Subunit: 372 residues, 2 copies
């Protein structure tokens, strides 16, 4: 019995089948079993978590309908949690953490940063330690650990979710959920989003499948996974196309991702301050980025999603190539497991139009049902 999802854990508690306190203790036991083996949870907060569970149950006794109430979960080390270090002890929750606690979740600890498989959120999830986790993703840190480990991840539309606590919003970067079921991604998006994202739905009718990218070779296995998902959609009465004149040049887009990424990964490297553009150049880049986003809007007038590889390889600045297709335009992107090959999980990334996040989740759910 693969472990219950976050909403099913929520349902279980609400329905009296279990208590928040039995759920957190069980999580802790699961962490204490594997942790000498995966070593994911680098920061523990079990004692306050156990009291959180007790607060959470009292709320259940007096009719609180918070949707994730009593569900144990974890977060990247890069998010501030009041009381825990962020290595530097933090005196208030990050915004996405304040929302998860408000919604009733219980933060057991924080996981690594993915210093290729992870030992992080993704590990914590595939291992079944907790059903819910929260990462970040500027160059794949959500979508590519999830590929590697066989879990789901949402990289939202840019600016959908405050990353205060993780301060202007940082261009390209986002924060997003990771979990083992599409339903959880949706519930979590719906908790985290600054404003309500479109339902926007209906099933897709035409999908675009890419397998190659001018900037890296892409492992046969990574291509195969797309081609599998393409066949499953084709065979369910959905038009699948391999190419369109509306697809923005991906080679140029990569370059632009490069340039922009530098700025960020260089603001904090004093020596390389003198390779920064002037201000007018910089603003030329944002105007360029917006032009790209509107080109992707033109593509999404023809197709309802785009399915691609999340990365070049399986597990074990051109491994960034497949992350940038969406991170640069700010498009929403979901990674969904579609099989195993050579002993190792194999996923696909689904991409939809700006602010069509739920549809991404929905279309990834469709792909997963039709292949598993």
């Amino acid at each position: 019995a693969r472990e219950p999802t976050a909403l099913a854990t929520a349902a279980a508690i609400r329905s009296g089948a279990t208590t928040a306190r039995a759920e957190t203790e069980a999580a802790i036991a699961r962490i204490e079993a594997l942790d000498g083996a995966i070593n994911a949870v680098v920061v523990r907060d079990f004692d306050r978590a156990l009291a959180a569970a007790d607060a959470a149950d009292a709320r259940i006794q007096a009719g609180d309908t918070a949707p994730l109430l009593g569900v144990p979960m974890t977060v990247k080390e890069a998010f501030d949690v009041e009381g825990l270090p962020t290595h530097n002890i933090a005196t208030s929750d990050a915004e996405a953490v304040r929302r998860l606690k408000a919604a009733g979740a219980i933060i057991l600890g924080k996981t690594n940063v993915p210093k290729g498989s992870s030992g992080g959120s993704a590990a914590a999830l595939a291992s079944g330690m907790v059903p819910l986790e929260l990462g970040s993703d500027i160059g794949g840190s959500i979508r590519i650990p999830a590929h590697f480990c066989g879990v789901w991840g949402l990289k939202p539309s840019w600016g959908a979710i405050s990353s205060h606590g993780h301060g202007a919003e940082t261009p390209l970067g986002v924060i997003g959920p990771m979990a083992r079921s599409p339903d959880d991604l949706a519930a979590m998006l719906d908790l985290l989003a600054t404003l309500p994202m479109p339902r926007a739905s209906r099933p897709p009718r035409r999908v675009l499948a890419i397998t190659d990218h001018p900037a890296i070779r892409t492992s046969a296995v990574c291509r195969d996974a797309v081609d599998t998902a393409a066949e499953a959609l084709a065979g369910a009465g959905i038009e699948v196309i391999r190419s369109t004149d509306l697809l923005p040049d991906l080679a140029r887009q990569h370059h632009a991702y490069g340039q922009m990424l530098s700025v960020a990964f260089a603001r904090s490297d004093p020596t390389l301050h003198a390779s920064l553009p002037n201000l007018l150049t910089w603003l030329s880049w944002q105007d360029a980025q917006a032009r790209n986003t509107r080109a992707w809007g033109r593509l999404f007038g023809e197709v309802d999603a785009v399915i691609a590889p999340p990365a070049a390889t399986q597990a074990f600045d051109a491994h960034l190539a497949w992350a940038g297709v969406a991170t640069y335009p700010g498009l929403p992107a979901v990674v969904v497991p579609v099989g195993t090959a050579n002993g190792l999980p194999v996923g696909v990334q689904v991409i939809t139009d700006f602010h069509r996040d739920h549809d991404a989740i929905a279309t990834a759910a469709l792909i997963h049902r039709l292949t598993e």
Copy 2:
């Protein structure tokens, strides 16, 4: 954790028709393919022949076979030869301990690391049964670290042919699993000759926490003291000292010297620090005298509980706790007794030569009384 079923319970399930060997192996495979992109233990897969083994195993079930681990999926260290798989060198016949596991009905899916591991494969729940080796802790110390059980048998109890010609002094091969019952069934399948059954609960136990050669983490000591309390509270005399305890400092030295020989036989550079033959024989005679000193201690106490290592999880003095048993050839079981600081914490139980089952038994007692 819907903790995973034991090997004997998987065996019962199949025997009773509640499941098939083939559903059990498929499930294992799925569980490996889930975690493997995360823990990365199973470096050698043989899934397609495993799936046919499962079908051979079911046919035997349809003709009334009561072989004790029939259809149970398991894994083995990479260092054991399995016919068809490499051992890095493709191997043309099973190691002896593998021939026995197949005869007894088990299905070898693949092979794990040398330090994840067997221990990871187990703690992760991928398979209920695994087979390691241990000259300086490779069984008992991964098991400590991960919260699984491990048996380092009495030396010579089990052929390690296939793991170089003669059995290697000090080294053993042993099983790893998640329950004492499994260890016993496996010992009893693997042992060249039948080992004495466990014929009574312990009445006096010796609890050691410190060792002249290393500092031992408070946590590692605490776990012993926990195990001591559980036994004390069940009417069992627990003592912290006896004059019959063989000098552990000298024993360490002897372990040092002997270990070198082995871990140096095939390392040209160290060849000139090898003893002469008469020296070597002085050492074996010394080792046999130690084994009989441990026998004198085991006339007074029925077991010895110690730390399996100095620390929890995540340099030849981390071997100090392994040597207490490996040197005299004593049997040794490591059993999980709780957690501290987010990580599993175990204890090693040691009994007299060929009192392996008692070791398992006394470790079962300690585990029941603390969980």
